């Protein structure tokens, strides 16, 4: 089939634009989450815990 | 006619613009002092001797940013205990690839060599290696102060080992190919490069002749003042130029013009024309048989890992350039 | 002391130079065979027929 | 039961009819035409007799 080839591109087209919003937002959200729950969480738990 | 055409095209497609290829030179030697130094500090355990640039850039005409800077890192092993086996020689019976065996343990017992971290079984591995210089590389070197010193953003690459100027301020960019490698052989030629062979054993080596390829075409042509590098830089230029051609490399180019090479012709630039419509001919009937047999190694068939009908599709794009010479260019 | 990057930039570096270069080099279209993906949705409709 | 064949053995001798009969199954619907369509750009399908294709 070539109709559903073109109907395919489409699909790949739409499976790569929203991943790329996806993985944009992954890179942002990431760190945020490890600077959240291990790094300013150890900076300031450390005291007490020493 | 093509005869000019070639001439124009070297000028205009292969010649890249000398104050880059100076600096390109400059960074190379630059980069290698500065990854000299660190490896000094990171890995004082391990003998590693002075980094050497070298590839296109400086085999040939002014290549500048073309293609890779080619950085040599010596693997000093301790001479008499590690020996050079034939990968076939092994149950990974891969004639390619090669191994560094461990030998003389009842004089030398592992752990007394800096080289026994890297000791699997009886065998170095290029593996272990790649992995702790590759992250030297990725985090470890303090690229930072490499872009403040040297006045340029230069960072790791995300594949093999790598490394991209992504601009030097004088209007530069490039692209570095690190060759970790065990000098080899008094000729200074002949590596055994710490290969990222994926399947069998990981821990393979691979025989560098690629300085011997060069060094063959170089002598061919000072054998009779001939012109079969030259030949060789259009044909780089005219792959740069053409996407049908991207599946061949420099080394697929090699191949190539090292068989053209080997023989007793015009070799002058006046017979360029002529001698760029043989270089189609015989890659063409290559591609036509789907087989391109390395000079230095005729198992291996350059062209087994490109698809048949891609590989004849490319034969008939060229096909096309000889019909029309002047197209390619 | 002035020296190898560490401590604080350093993990900047691997939230960007590692982390988001690293991000970078995925897909978007890796695993994308128009072929493979033809199948994936004659399998998404499945028993039925589809318009 | 040493050989691959031994599966087709009736009595002492291969049985041509059962080859038929698996090999025709399995064109008839194991194998799968909508992908040999879609590669090839196609209708391609089985036949309703003998062993037979229809493009």
């Given at each position: 089939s070539a109709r559903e080839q073109r109907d395919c591109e489409v699909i790949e087209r739409l499976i790569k634009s929203y991943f790329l919003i996806v993985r944009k937002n992954i890179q942002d959200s990431v760190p945020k989450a490890v600077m959240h729950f291990l790094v300013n969480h150890v900076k300031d738990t450390l005291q007490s815990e020493l | 006619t093509l005869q000019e055409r070639l001439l124009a095209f070297e000028?205009?497609?292969?010649?890249?613009?000398?104050?880059?290829?100076?600096?390109?030179?400059?960074?190379?030697?630059?980069?290698?002092?500065?990854?000299?130094?660190?490896?000094?500090?990171?890995?004082?355990?391990?003998?590693?001797?002075?980094?050497?640039?070298?590839?296109?850039?400086?085999?040939?005409?002014?290549?500048?940013?073309?293609?890779?800077?080619?950085?040599?890192?010596?693997?000093?092993?301790?001479?008499?205990?590690?020996?050079?086996?034939?990968?076939?020689?092994?149950?990974?019976?891969?004639?390619?690839?090669?191994?560094?065996?461990?030998?003389?343990?009842?004089?030398?017992?592992?752990?007394?060599?800096?080289?026994?971290?890297?000791?699997?079984?009886?065998?170095?591995?290029?593996?272990?290696?790649?992995?702790?210089?590759?992250?030297?590389?990725?985090?470890?070197?303090?690229?930072?102060?490499?872009?403040?010193?040297?006045?340029?953003?230069?960072?790791?690459?995300?594949?093999?080992?790598?490394?991209?100027?992504?601009?030097?301020?004088?209007?530069?960019?490039?692209?570095?190919?690190?060759?970790?490698?065990?000098?080899?052989?008094?000729?200074?030629?002949?590596?055994?490069?710490?290969?990222?062979?994926?399947?069998?054993?990981?821990?393979?080596?691979?025989?560098?002749?690629?300085?011997?390829?060069?060094?063959?075409?170089?002598?061919?042509?000072?054998?009779?003042?001939?012109?079969?590098?030259?030949?060789?830089?259009?044909?780089?230029?005219?792959?740069?130029?053409?996407?049908?051609?991207?599946?061949?490399?420099?080394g697929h180019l090699t191949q190539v013009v090292l068989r053209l090479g080997e023989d007793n012709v015009d070799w002058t630039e006046e017979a360029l024309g002529e001698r760029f419509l043989q270089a189609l001919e015989l890659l063409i009937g290559s591609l036509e048989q789907a087989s391109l047999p390395c000079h230095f190694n005729p198992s291996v068939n350059l062209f087994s890992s490109l698809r048949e009908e891609e590989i004849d599709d490319i034969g008939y794009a060229l096909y096309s350039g000889l019909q029309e010479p002047e197209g390619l260019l | 002391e002035t020296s190898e990057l560490c401590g604080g930039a350093r993990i900047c570096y691997i939230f960007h130079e590692t982390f988001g270069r690293t991000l970078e080099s995925v897909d978007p279209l890796g695993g994308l065979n128009t072929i493979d993906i033809l199948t994936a949705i004659r399998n998404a409709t499945g028993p039925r027929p589809a318009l």
């Open positions: - | 000028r205009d497609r292969v010649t890249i613009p000398a104050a880059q290829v100076a600096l390109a030179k400059q960074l190379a030697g630059d980069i290698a002092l500065e990854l000299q130094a660190y490896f000094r500090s990171k890995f004082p355990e391990l003998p590693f001797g002075a980094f050497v640039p070298g590839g296109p850039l400086y085999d040939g005409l002014q290549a500048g940013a073309a293609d890779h800077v080619r950085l040599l890192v010596p693997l000093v092993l301790e001479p008499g205990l590690w020996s050079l086996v034939p990968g076939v020689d092994t149950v990974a019976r891969d004639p390619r690839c090669w191994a560094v065996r461990r030998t003389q343990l009842e004089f030398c017992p592992r752990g007394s060599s800096p080289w026994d971290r890297f000791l699997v079984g009886g065998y170095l591995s290029s593996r272990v290696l790649l992995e702790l210089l590759r992250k030297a590389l990725a985090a470890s070197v303090n690229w930072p102060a490499i872009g403040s010193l040297l006045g340029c953003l230069i960072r790791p690459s995300m594949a093999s080992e790598e490394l991209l100027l992504e601009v030097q301020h004088e209007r530069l960019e490039l692209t570095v190919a690190v060759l970790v490698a065990v000098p080899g052989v008094d000729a200074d030629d002949r590596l055994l490069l710490a290969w990222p062979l994926e399947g069998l054993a990981g821990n393979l080596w691979l025989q560098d002749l690629y300085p011997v390829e060069a060094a063959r075409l170089r002598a061919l042509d000072d054998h009779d003042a001939g012109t079969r590098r030259r030949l060789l830089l259009l044909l780089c230029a005219v792959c740069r130029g053409c996407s049908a051609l991207g599946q061949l490399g420099r | -």
